Amino acid sequence: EVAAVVVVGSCMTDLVSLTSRLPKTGETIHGHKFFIGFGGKGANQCVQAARLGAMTSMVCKVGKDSFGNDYIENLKQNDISTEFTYQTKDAATGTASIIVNNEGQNIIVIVAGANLLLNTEDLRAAANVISRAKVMVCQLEITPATSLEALTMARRSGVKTLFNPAPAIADLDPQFYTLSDVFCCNESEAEILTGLTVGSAADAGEAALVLLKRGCQVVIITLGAEGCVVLSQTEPEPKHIPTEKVKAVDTTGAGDSFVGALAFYLAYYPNLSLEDMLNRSNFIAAVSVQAAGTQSSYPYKKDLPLTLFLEHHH
Amino acid sequence: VAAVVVVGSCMTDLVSLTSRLPKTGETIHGHKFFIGFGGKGANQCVQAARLGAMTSMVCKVGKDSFGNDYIENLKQNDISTEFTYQTKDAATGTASIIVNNEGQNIIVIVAGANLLLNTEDLRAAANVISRAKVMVCQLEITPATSLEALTMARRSGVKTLFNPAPAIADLDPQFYTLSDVFCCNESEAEILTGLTVGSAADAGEAALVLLKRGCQVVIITLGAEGCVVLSQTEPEPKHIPTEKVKAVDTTGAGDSFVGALAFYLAYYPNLSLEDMLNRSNFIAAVSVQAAGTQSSYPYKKDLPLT
Numbered sequence: 001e002v003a004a005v006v007v008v009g010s011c012m013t014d015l016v017s018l019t020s021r022l023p024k025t026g027e028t029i030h031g032h033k034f035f036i037g038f039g040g041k042g043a044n045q046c047v048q049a050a051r052l053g054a055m056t057s058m059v060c061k062v063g064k065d066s067f068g069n070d071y072i073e074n075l076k077q078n079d080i081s082t083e084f085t086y087q088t089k090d091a092a093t094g095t096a097s098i099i100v101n102n103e104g105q106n107i108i109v110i111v112a113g114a115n116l117l118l119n120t121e122d123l124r125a126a127a128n129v130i131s132r133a134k135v136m137v138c139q140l141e142i143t144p145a146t147s148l149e150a151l152t153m154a155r156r157s158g159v160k161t162l163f164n165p166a167p168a169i170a171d172l173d174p175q176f177y178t179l180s181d182v183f184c185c186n187e188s189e190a191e192i193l194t195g196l197t198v199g200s201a202a203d204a205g206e207a208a209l210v211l212l213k214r215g216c217q218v219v220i221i222t223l224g225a226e227g228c229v230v231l232s233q234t235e236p237e238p239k240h241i242p243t244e245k246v247k248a249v250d251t252t253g254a255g256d257s258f259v260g261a262l263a264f265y266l267a268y269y270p271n272l273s274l275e276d277m278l279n280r281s282n283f284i285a286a287v288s289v290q291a292a293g294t295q296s297s298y299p300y301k302k303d304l305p306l307t308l309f310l311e312h313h314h
Numbered sequence: 315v316a317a318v319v320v321v322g323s324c325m326t327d328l329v330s331l332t333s334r335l336p337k338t339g340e341t342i343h344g345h346k347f348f349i350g351f352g353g354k355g356a357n358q359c360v361q362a363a364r365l366g367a368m369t370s371m372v373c374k375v376g377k378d379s380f381g382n383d384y385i386e387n388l389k390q391n392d393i394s395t396e397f398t399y400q401t402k403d404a405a406t407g408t409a410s411i412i413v414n415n416e417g418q419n420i421i422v423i424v425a426g427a428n429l430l431l432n433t434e435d436l437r438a439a440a441n442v443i444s445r446a447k448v449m450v451c452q453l454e455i456t457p458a459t460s461l462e463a464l465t466m467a468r469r470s471g472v473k474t475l476f477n478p479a480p481a482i483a484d485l486d487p488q489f490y491t492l493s494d495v496f497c498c499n500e501s502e503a504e505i506l507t508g509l510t511v512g513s514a515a516d517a518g519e520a521a522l523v524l525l526k527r528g529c530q531v532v533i534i535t536l537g538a539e540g541c542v543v544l545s546q547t548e549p550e551p552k553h554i555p556t557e558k559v560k561a562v563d564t565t566g567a568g569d570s571f572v573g574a575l576a577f578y579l580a581y582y583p584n585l586s587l588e589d590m591l592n593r594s595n596f597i598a599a600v601s602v603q604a605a606g607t608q609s610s611y612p613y614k615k616d617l618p619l620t
């Protein structure tokens with residue numbers, strides 16, 4: 001009956017306008033389509049996990065506005081607990097305004113808004129839900145100090161920590177590394193965090209080694225169509241996990257699918273090998289890249305192969 | 315009974331403030347976001363309503379959050395929504411704006427549901443239109459629809475107030491002959507006439523070209539310089555200046571002016587035109603003294619009794 005995956009992080013409303021050319025300074029242009037979507041890394045990861053069958057709770061803060069009420073309703077529609085989804089008069093729900101041209105190039109303006117007002121007192125009220133969970137998931141779209149306190153609470157209670165340093169900041173508090181049981185980022189994030197170039201999968205292996213030695217138990221670097229790379233303290237040699245080639249329609253939010261799937265497996269299938277979790281997580285994320293719309297492309301359990309939810313005797 | 319009927323656009327304004335504007339491929343973080351209720355049609359309707367006009371807004375929005383919220387905004391300003399349609403086929407119109415610290419911006423408009431307001435939708439409103447005093451249109455909906463709205467008003471003896479905004483270079487000349495009052499700004503007059511409009515004397519000359527295309531009355535708004543007016547009976551340009559004020563935010567001031575004018579045409583038909591425009595200048599100038607477009611439009615109770 002209790003939540004097994006707890007996500008502390010961000011909800012954002014995505015506001016997207018499609019145009020033929022991007023506008024220059026001082027220009028007014030007309031686009032040909034507008035749409036809304038439910039976004040934010042925290043809520044994206046939570047939604048994927050829930051749709052796989054996880055019992056989830058989303059700890060976040062939105063506005064006391066239309067976007068916020070709508071966000072709450074979106075979480076409820078996906079069977080996510082909103083017990084610790086706070087609303088505040090003091091800021092608008094977080095927004096991501098995105099303008100896209102015909103070649104796929106874009107301009108993006110994020111206003112984090114209510115997400116920055118999720119504070120330490122707000123977490124403390126959730127201590128019980130956090131201590132009874134199997135996994136706690138965080139990112140860097142809320143106040144860093146809040147994510148860091150979340151990771152600390154989870155650790156104190158023996159709860160597994162899954163940390164996604166996204167978007168990445170150059171001079172990240174090293175406590176994030178030592179509080180991370182599983183540290184998962186993409187290629188360009190690994191460039192920012194380590195100062196290294198990441199073109200190939202071999203390069204990603206070297207970057208991942210630097211992050212491992214800063215104190216992470218497990219490091220995973222996602223690589224788009226190349227799948228992912230994993231290292232651990234017990235197995236520090238890079239292990240490249242490729243994925244079956246697919247016609248990518250839209251890769252937006254695929255990383256959040258991957259991480260949400262990974263949370264699902266860490267929580268409900270703790271005995272699987274790590275290599276196995278990542279295969280399944282690749283597969284699920286790859287289903288998401290085959291459809292448009294971020295959260296609306298994340299697959300439900302009922303639409304997936306049944307073997308993704310089986311395990312043999314160990 | 316409604317005395318002012320507006321056939322036109324409702325848009326949701328989505329505004330993000332940043333320190334610098336973003337280049338191609340950039341993700342940047344702004345420091346504030348806000349929502350506002352916009353669209354020229356609704357803006358003009360709202361100013362007229364706040365002055366005490368009984369108004370009806372004929373428009374189309376989406377069957378979405380933004381649309382429901384728009385309907386509620388109109389109701390909150392005592393506007394009839396009898397002919398505010400909602401459609402599944404498109405989203406409520408949007409204007410996405412990104413503004414830096416120096417006030418420079420990038421804007422992306424998606425007209426959305428506004429372009430689906432058609433001729434059948436207007437036909438149902440024929441009764442409300444024929445019992446009105448004034449009909450107001452702009453160019454943010456399908457031009458053919460505005461043009462039919464003007465034609466219905468004319469047929470029923472209803473006064474037509476047309477605001478060709480944003481302006482198109484090759485405007486159907488039927489718009490000129492169906493306009494009892496034709497009102498635009500400086501840069502719009504440049505587009506419609508091909509002439510330069512730096513001064514108030516230039517505006518007078520541009521206004522004369524528009525008059526000779528068949529308008530009864532031509533008014534050209536001029537920001538801090540007020541406005542210029544000509545008519546078929548008095549074709550010499552008359553410059554109406556306005557008191558200097560510390561402008562906080564001029565966004566939507568043209569829509570305040572036009573809504574005020576609709577109010578006066580409908581409820582004070584005996585005032586001289588010069589008088590209407592003085593009052594309309596004053597009301598619009600109150601609006602420039604505050605931020606927020608519609609929220610800066612003054613109510614009657616907050617205005618001098620005259």
Ligand SMILES: Nc1ncnc2c1ncn2[C@@H]1O[C@H](COP(=O)(O)OP(N)(=O)O)[C@@H](O)[C@H]1O
Pocket residue numbers: 185186187222223224225227228243244245246248251252253254255256258281282283285286289
């Ligand atoms: N083209 C593609 N084909 C198959 N799988 C893909 C893919 N692009 C992304 N993926 C999957 O999604 C994961 C995350 O990709 P990533 O590029 O890091 O996230 P993002 N920046 O696209 O939101 C990969 O590890 C992989 O499992």
Ligand SMILES: Nc1ncnc2c1ncn2[C@@H]1O[C@H](COP(=O)(O)OP(N)(=O)O)[C@@H](O)[C@H]1O
Pocket residue numbers: 499500535536537538540541556557558559561564565566567568569571594595596598599602
């Ligand atoms: N700075 C200002 N001071 C006083 N009145 C002002 C003003 N800027 C605009 N106005 C008034 O509002 C009207 C519309 O200005 P205009 O510049 O055409 O509207 P807009 N394009 O800013 O929305 C003018 O006719 C004038 O009455």
Ligand code: NA
Pocket residue numbers: 166186255256
């Ligand atoms: Na990611």
Ligand code: NA
Pocket residue numbers: 250251252253254288289290291292293294297
């Ligand atoms: Na997708």
Ligand code: NA
Pocket residue numbers: 479499567568569
């Ligand atoms: Na205007």
Ligand code: NA
Pocket residue numbers: 563564565566567601602603604605606607610
């Ligand atoms: Na204003």
